[PDB]
């Protein structure tokens with residue numbers, strides 16, 4: 001049903017049921033927008049300055065999520081991407097850069113939504 005909803009989720013370490021380090025840097029619940037058969041997720045990233053790339057799987061490939069807003073003062077931003085089956089794991093990729101702590105990596109993670117959770 002068309003509209004905007006809260007949706008809880010967890011970020012999981014690649015190919016596991018373990019909570020990813022990344023989970024610390026996203027806000028749950030996300031906002032799910034349902035619009036004529038399609039589902040979009042708007043998700044807030046914390047420590048935005050550090051997260052230099054964020055991609056999700058779509059059409060067999062990986063695509064940069066759209067940045068729909070940034071809050072420079074809070075150092076957060078909101079990315080938006082499409083989801084299909086809210087009960088299935090969604091593959092994602094993230095690139096992290098922290099110059100001062102010489103931390104420069106990219107990773108694969110899965111996102112797992114839980115439509116039933118409040």
Ligand code: HEM
Pocket residue numbers: 012013014019020021022025047050051094096098101103107108109
């Ligand atoms: C000062 C900040 C950070 C520190 C000290 C740190 C430290 C670590 C360490 C030691 C690991 C490998 C050991 C482990 O799995 O716990 C790791 C893995 C990982 N980190 Fe970082 N990290 C930091 C920031 C971030 C940020 C901002 C992200 C955003 C995505 C991130 C995402 C990940 C991911 C996806 C992994 C692979 C394992 C997993 O999914 O849990 N980290 N981090």
Ligand SMILES: [Zn+2]
Pocket residue numbers: 104105106
């Ligand atoms: Zn690495």
